[PDB]
Scaffold this motif. Structure first.
Motif, short mmCIF file in Angstrom:
data_model
loop_
_atom_site.label_atom_id
_atom_site.label_comp_id
_atom_site.label_asym_id
_atom_site.label_seq_id
_atom_site.Cartn_x
_atom_site.Cartn_y
_atom_site.Cartn_z
N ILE A 243 -55.13 -28.05 -54.26
CA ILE A 243 -54.60 -27.31 -53.62
C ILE A 243 -53.41 -25.89 -54.08
O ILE A 243 -53.73 -25.05 -53.43
CB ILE A 243 -53.47 -27.29 -52.72
N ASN A 244 -53.37 -26.23 -55.70
CA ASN A 244 -53.28 -25.65 -57.12
C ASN A 244 -54.30 -23.80 -57.36
O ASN A 244 -54.09 -23.13 -57.39
CB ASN A 244 -53.62 -26.14 -58.35
N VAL B 280 -41.36 -23.91 -56.16
CA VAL B 280 -42.39 -24.72 -54.91
C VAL B 280 -41.24 -25.77 -54.40
O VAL B 280 -40.55 -26.84 -55.24
CB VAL B 280 -43.78 -25.55 -56.00
N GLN C 122 -48.85 -27.65 -64.43
CA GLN C 122 -50.15 -27.21 -64.05
C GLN C 122 -50.60 -26.53 -62.89
O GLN C 122 -51.60 -25.78 -63.47
CB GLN C 122 -50.03 -28.36 -62.97
N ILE C 123 -49.47 -25.52 -62.08
CA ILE C 123 -49.62 -24.25 -61.58
C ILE C 123 -49.70 -23.36 -62.73
O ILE C 123 -50.11 -22.11 -62.49
CB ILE C 123 -48.69 -23.57 -60.34
N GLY D 264 -36.82 -38.93 -66.42
CA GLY D 264 -35.86 -39.85 -65.22
C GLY D 264 -36.60 -39.22 -64.06
O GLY D 264 -38.37 -38.94 -63.28
N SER E 5 -41.49 -27.06 -59.78
CA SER E 5 -40.88 -27.73 -57.89
C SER E 5 -39.71 -28.13 -58.30
O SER E 5 -39.06 -28.55 -59.11
CB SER E 5 -42.23 -28.30 -58.24
N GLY F 147 -41.38 -29.11 -65.82
CA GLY F 147 -42.05 -29.89 -65.58
C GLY F 147 -43.88 -30.30 -65.24
O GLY F 147 -44.14 -29.38 -65.16
N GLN F 148 -44.24 -31.43 -64.47
CA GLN F 148 -45.44 -31.17 -64.29
C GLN F 148 -46.01 -30.16 -63.24
O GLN F 148 -47.45 -30.17 -63.62
CB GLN F 148 -45.63 -32.55 -63.34
N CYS F 149 -45.61 -29.74 -62.13
CA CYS F 149 -45.91 -28.99 -61.30
C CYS F 149 -45.91 -27.43 -62.27
O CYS F 149 -47.04 -26.66 -62.21
CB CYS F 149 -45.22 -28.67 -60.44
N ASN G 100 -45.48 -27.33 -50.26
CA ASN G 100 -46.28 -27.76 -49.87
C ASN G 100 -46.59 -28.36 -48.50
O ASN G 100 -47.97 -28.73 -48.22
CB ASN G 100 -46.36 -28.99 -50.71
N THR H 167 -36.77 -34.25 -63.70
CA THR H 167 -36.17 -33.73 -64.65
C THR H 167 -36.74 -32.14 -65.39
O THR H 167 -35.89 -32.08 -65.28
CB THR H 167 -36.53 -34.53 -66.08
N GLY H 168 -37.72 -31.91 -64.53
CA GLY H 168 -38.35 -30.42 -64.55
C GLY H 168 -37.31 -29.73 -63.66
O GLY H 168 -36.92 -27.77 -64.05
N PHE I 97 -54.03 -32.40 -55.97
CA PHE I 97 -53.21 -31.50 -56.45
C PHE I 97 -53.77 -31.04 -56.87
O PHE I 97 -53.39 -29.20 -56.85
CB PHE I 97 -52.04 -32.45 -58.04
N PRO J 98 -40.97 -29.71 -51.47
CA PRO J 98 -41.27 -30.29 -51.26
C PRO J 98 -42.13 -29.87 -49.61
O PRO J 98 -42.73 -31.76 -49.39
CB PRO J 98 -40.41 -31.66 -51.22
N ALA K 26 -38.26 -30.47 -56.09
CA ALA K 26 -37.84 -31.21 -55.92
C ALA K 26 -38.32 -32.87 -57.28
O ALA K 26 -36.65 -32.41 -57.74
CB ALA K 26 -39.57 -31.77 -54.86
#
Ligand SMILES: Nc1nc2c(ncn2[C@@H]2O[C@H](COP(=O)(O)OP(=O)(O)O)[C@@H](O)[C@H]2O)c(=O)[nH]1
Ligand SMILES: Nc1ncnc2c1ncn2[C@@H]1O[C@H](COP(=O)(O)OP(=O)(O)O)[C@@H](O)[C@H]1O
Lengths: 176, 369
Positions: B187-188, B141, B14-15, B72, B111, B9-11, B168, B115-116, B184, B143, B113
């Motif tokens: 906090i990362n 992680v 990134q982390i 999605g 995360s 996922g996006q999180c 978060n 697709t990931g 974002f 939400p 919260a």
């Protein structure tokens, strides 16, 4: 002999040569480097050997001393580590680059007498000493070392400052 | 032993990308993945150097970064697409596992919260199918967000071998309190410091804690109670760091009692006074412990990266973590009465009820049976 041995210390931009007057060759030669962690100070070959864990400093990178704190450490190293003598017990002859600022000459003098308590000292221009070694008092010396090169005209033992030329091209540049 | 990391996922990307930047700078590794000249055992997380990452739009911005040379919204939609590429992504893992000397575990950064989160729940089950003898630790992680959160909880309670919670709401409050951000990418910075500090005793070898199971075998008492929380104080004596970690203002979590505590002191502190401080912290009784079985507090030292002062991290197992599940639980019921079988939601809702029921009964003098 009544006199203790006199020391001869050639301060080089890349390598320092040290020994005793009267000898045919220096007793020690080491890198003009001082290193501290990235034993608190490392000097010479050890600094080079452990450069991986140190930040190296070159206090006389182009023939002229730029950091006296580390130059003092190089001299301390020279006496106690390399030559294993007490400077307060031996006269010391030091070498200097051509066109060395007058203030630097006074600094070197003050450090020898006040910091190392040398009983006696003297400073001579590197190029002049090389000419002497060739059995001459007059001639022009092309001195090319590690971090600097000089062409030094010398007449009757005296370097002629107005005619001295400095070339910032030497061994280091050739290696690279 | 080696540990393969996954980023979902996006999180997770990134982390994880910020985890590797911090871990590269902590070591002597140039952004070009080449060792600079300038003891630290780095074979666990780096391969001879190549990171053992499996990344899964955001990838492009990573590839346009100066670190390109370093490699999605439903839960059902995130579960199905993983089934159609089941064989695909495992070939990457199967070659990395067998190409590895002796695999130990699977770090997961994701995360919950969407697709990931859905892809994560799928992969967590299959790893139990193929590899039965490999730990799976997840740096989840917190939400339709209530739906997805509880579904992945159904898998995280019986699949993931350990779990470190990072919500978060606790991190965002810190950024406004002691950093005054009002992002974002901001906090990362804190998440990266906790992750990099979590595996500190693995990269700098000491007399103890030379393997991932060594840290986990002390905290988690039974396979059910496998949730942990963190604490990071400097945002200096060792007695100061211990007392600042046990304050509620520092924990990253929005009767009850502690089960086990682990302290990571990363400074150049005097290692002779560490045994003194544990004598006096016991006297003030700053923390209340389980009555059924014996429990204690653990302090472990390490060394900071010289290429980059005292810090501290605290991994604890507090039964007050049951409250977080309650919020997701209660939030689910309110949506269930408001709007092919919808039976999986029923099982997930039921199994998390047993986990919560374990915690509230874990604080009684008769948790035995
Ligand atoms: N802690 C943390 N959480 C993040 C970060 N970026 C995104 N998230 C979480 O990820 C969720 C959004 O997921 P999203 O990226 O839309 O899922 P995807 O579209 O399936 O990749 C949000 O609810 C956030 O809480 C981050 O940098 N740090
Ligand atoms: N045989 C050689 N041929 C070429 N260069 C040499 C040779 N021996 C030494 N050098 C080079 O000479 C330099 C050192 O000479 P030196 O006169 O001691 O310099 P300095 O006094 O400035 O330290 C170094 O760059 C070294 O690589």
């Amino acid at each position: 002999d009544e006199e203790v041995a006199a020391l001869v210390v050639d301060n080089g931009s890349g390598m320092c040569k040290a020994g005793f007057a009267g000898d045919d060759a220096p007793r020690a030669v080491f890198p003009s480097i001082v290193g501290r962690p990235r034993k608190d100070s490392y000097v010479g070959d050890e600094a080079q050997s452990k450069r991986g864990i140190l930040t190296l400093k070159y206090p006389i990178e182009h023939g002229i001393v730029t950091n006296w704190d580390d130059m003092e450490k190089i001299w301390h190293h020279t006496f106690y580590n390399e030559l294993r003598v007490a400077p307060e017990e031996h006269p010391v002859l030091l070498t200097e680059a051509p066109l060395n600022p007058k203030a630097n000459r006074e600094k070197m003098t003050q450090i020898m007498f006040e910091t190392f308590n040398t009983p006696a000292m003297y400073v001579a221009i590197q190029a002049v000493l090389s000419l002497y070694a060739s059995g001459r008092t007059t001639g022009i010396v092309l001195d090319s070392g590690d971090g600097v090169s000089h062409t030094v005209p010398i007449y009757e033992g005296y370097a002629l400052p107005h005619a001295i030329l400095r070339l910032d091209l030497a061994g280091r540049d050739l290696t690279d | 032993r080696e540990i393969i990391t996954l980023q979902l996922g996006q999180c997770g990307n990134q982390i994880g990308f910020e985890f590797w930047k911090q871990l590269c700078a902590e070591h002597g590794i140039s952004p070009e993945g080449i060792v600079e000249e300038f003891t630290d055992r780095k074979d666990v997380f780096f391969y001879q150097y190549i990171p053992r990452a499996v990344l899964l739009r955001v990838i492009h911005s990573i590839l346009n970064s100066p670190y390109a040379k370093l490699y999605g919204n439903n839960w059902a939609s995130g579960f199905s697409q993983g089934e159609k590429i089941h064989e695909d992504i495992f070939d990457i893992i199967d070659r990395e596992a067998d190409g590895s000397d002796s695999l130990e575990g699977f770090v997961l950064c994701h995360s919950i919260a969407g697709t990931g989160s859905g892809l994560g729940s799928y992969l967590l089950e299959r790893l139990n199918d193929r590899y039965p003898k490999k730990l799976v630790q997840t740096y989840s992680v917190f939400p339709v967000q209530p739906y997805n959160s509880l579904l992945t909880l159904k898998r995280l309670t019986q699949n993931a071998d350990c779990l470190v919670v990072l919500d978060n709401t606790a991190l965002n409050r810190i950024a406004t309190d002691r950093l005054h951000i009002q992002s974002f990418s901001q906090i990362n910075q804190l998440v990266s410091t906790i992750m990099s500090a979590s595996t500190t005793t693995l990269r700098y070898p000491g007399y103890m804690n030379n393997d991932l199971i060594g840290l986990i075998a002390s905290l988690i008492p039974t396979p059910r109670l496998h949730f942990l929380m963190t604490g990071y104080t400097p945002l200096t004596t060792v007695l100061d760091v211990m007392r600042r970690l046990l304050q509620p203002k520092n924990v990253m979590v929005s009767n009850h009692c502690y089960i086990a505590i682990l302290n990571i002191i990363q400074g150049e502190v005097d290692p002779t006074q560490v045994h003194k401080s544990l004598q006096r912290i016991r006297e003030r009784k700053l923390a209340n412990f389980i009555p059924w079985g014996p429990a204690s507090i653990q302090v472990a030292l390490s060394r900071k990266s010289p290429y980059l002062r005292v810090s501290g991290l605290m991994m604890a197992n507090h039964t007050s973590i049951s409250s977080l599940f309650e919020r997701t639980c209660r939030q689910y019921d309110k949506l269930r009465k408001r709007e092919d079988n919808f039976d999986e939601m029923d099982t997930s809702r039921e199994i998390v009820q047993q986990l919560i029921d374990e915690y509230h009964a874990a604080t009684r003098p008769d948790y035995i049976s």
